[PDB]
Amino acid sequence: HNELIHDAVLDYYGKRLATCSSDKTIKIFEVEGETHKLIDTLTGHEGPVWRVDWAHPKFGTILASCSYDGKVLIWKEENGRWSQIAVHAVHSASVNSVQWAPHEYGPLLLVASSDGKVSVVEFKENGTTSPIIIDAHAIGVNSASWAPATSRKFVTGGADNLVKIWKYNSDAQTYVLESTLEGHSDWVRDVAWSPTVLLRSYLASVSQDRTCIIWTQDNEQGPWKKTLLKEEKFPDVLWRASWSLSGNVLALSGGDNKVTLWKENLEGKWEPAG
Amino acid sequence: NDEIDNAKLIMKERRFTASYTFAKFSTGSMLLTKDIVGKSGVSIKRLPTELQRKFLFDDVYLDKEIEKVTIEARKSNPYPQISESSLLFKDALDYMEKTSSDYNLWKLSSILFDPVSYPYKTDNDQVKMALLKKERHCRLTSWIVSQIGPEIEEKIRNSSNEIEQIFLYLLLNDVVRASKLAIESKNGHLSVLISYLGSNDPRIRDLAELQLQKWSTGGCSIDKNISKIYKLLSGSPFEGLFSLKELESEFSWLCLLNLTLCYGQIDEYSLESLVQSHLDKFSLPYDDPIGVIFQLYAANENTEKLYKEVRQRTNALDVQFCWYLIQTLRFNGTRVFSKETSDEATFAFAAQLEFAQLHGHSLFVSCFLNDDKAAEDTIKRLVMREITLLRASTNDHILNRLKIPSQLIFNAQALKDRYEGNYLSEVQNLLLGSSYDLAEMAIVTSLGPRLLLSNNPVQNNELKTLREILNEFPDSERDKWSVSINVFEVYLKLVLDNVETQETIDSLISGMKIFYDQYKHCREVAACCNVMSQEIVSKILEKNNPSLGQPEKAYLR
16 A cells, blocks of 8 residues: 555656555655655655646756655665755745756756746756746645746646736746637646647646636647537546646546547647547 | 544545546556555556557568658758658568458558659650550459459459459459350350450440440340440440449459459550449449549549548558558659648557557657647657667667767767666666756765765775766866866865865865755755865864764864
8 A cells, every 4th residue: 555646757767666655655666667765755844745746857856856745856766775965945835846947958957836926946056946936826825836838938827717827038037928818617726737848838727616628829929719628517526637748638637547649630629548 | 433434525626536547648658547455456447459460560560661761851940851751561471361351451551652763764665654554454453353253253253244254254364264155155256255355455345335336326225234344345345335233243343353354455545544433333432442542543632632531431450550541652753632631540559569669660750740849749759758668679779870969869878877776887888878967966965975985096086087077078067067077077076185185175165165055855965065065174174063062073182
């Protein structure tokens, strides 16, 4: 047995499965088959540790993990002996997301919590964590993630049901409110921007009324078309999801312990894939 | 027990439920579908492969597709593209199984979607051109004839009119045999008529037409198959005064296509127009894959429109096959097809190739994005993502040797081997490797407490054989030094020769002070500068403040 996992993300090279569970430990099971071998138990956080996220190499790998308490502990190897570099402890509610940027933008850690805040946690070689806080919602921001489609945004999805496209300016190293999308009766849990290598981006607005509205754009600036994955109230409040890098298979997790892999056919409508 | 209600009220602040699951994507685009029993508490799922051809798993079939292609040194972007796809559909007819209308499908496009020509020049142009279409027709009618094999042989065995047997022999294209059975029915004049066939000529049509019409205004009782023999003779199997619908309820639509191409004039028309008039007459399914071959030989002229529509209606052709036709016949130009048809089918095909962990084969396919930025981002990204999958073959490693700048893939390689868990030998392989083309700043900070392993003359003079490369390559990323790497010019000439300061010592106390800033994350690297200082100034009576206390700089006291 393993206690209730709430995220287990892999490296950019696909090795260190980071199972962060309700036992308050991130158990780094470095993958060699079924010899997912425990290389470190990451004791630090003081509540159930919900999300992990790995940074792509440029320095190492820096695991940034987040939790109930408000602590995003900046985990970094010292010859595999992981410890926090520093602590980003700025967030006074249960922290939702943790999420590393491509190094087109910098090593920018994007942290949101449902205290309202989204900090662009800009990182430096002197081991500092630097917040550029906006408050994007006030019933809480339940995710924030970047938009590395071909550019430069993070999208928020939160508790007041709004889905706010924060497109680039970098006037300060936070982005300006371009637009605001709306179409739910319950909280936007997850905003899953398509990390595609083509011009199109989609945005599966995975929700707690169980309408996974994929707003379909045909471009960066394009229309926000309501072409929902599931166009009903699908059973149990929908958990975390991502778009494939290439193949556009919406892995729409439920809360019902099924992940509705639902690939794309060309018309912006959605057909099964497991 | 205390834990149970705790985590309940926490997860109702969170608005999570007590049952939870996630599966997310990774570096070979695969899932980590939580199920609750595992010690990683995932079941790492293969995402289903939508493309499962057994002859993708030959890497020499990757190499056949590179050789039927002219590789394009492109000038918007350095990454490879294709100047000319003359890709054959005979390159999978040697790896495929040979029984299947999968084999007949791929063969039909080998007669139609790759050329057929007559070898040597016949004297007039109209004649030369007719013999390309006649050669193509020999293969093509063999095809039509082969595939109506069982349905005709079934009715040969069965009880039949005498003239129903002559007609059916003629459907498998037998002429003499049909005449000999005519001969047996005591009909000599008839057997003359069966031995025109294989050939029409204009005078017999007018006589055959005149005779069917004599029958109409004549008496009662006719045979149907006798009427069919005159339909062949009229030159007009369907486009005469009767149209054959008795053989689309008993036989196929393919049994109909034999009748136009053999007794509906024998390529005095072009093929293309014959098969198009024959679509209009009889609806050739949008649901048979061998059907859609005919249909986009019929609609050669403006392929693109009818191709989009039938790609929704035939899924018993694979996404390989759909892509293959756009590639072959767009740089040949015979089928109108946009760039973006090739760009949508490239993404799709490459994406299924990735789910099978065939990323060499994915790469080659993503090269056929011939929109310029599209094969910037895709080529870049797919190499930088996975390295060992692209060194899994030598033919894989040729596609990175191709028009890709060694450079990309060594940059992928050493980005991967940059961790902090092996990092001494592989931060050397940014500089030794030289795709980053000088990047030894992080080698300063990986040779702080790694002069604390052993000091011996060529471990001493290892930091003056990777620090001479500082200047062999011009200043590039993280670089411009000779204060902080004028520490290790003179750390050597300090501990070798007793020195009365030559003032590169005076660069080096500054350099140790620069080096104290830098620790790039490791336990002590900003106190290892002490170690290297307190090794060496101490060759003049000079005490200066450390890079704490006075024995940390000098070891004089």
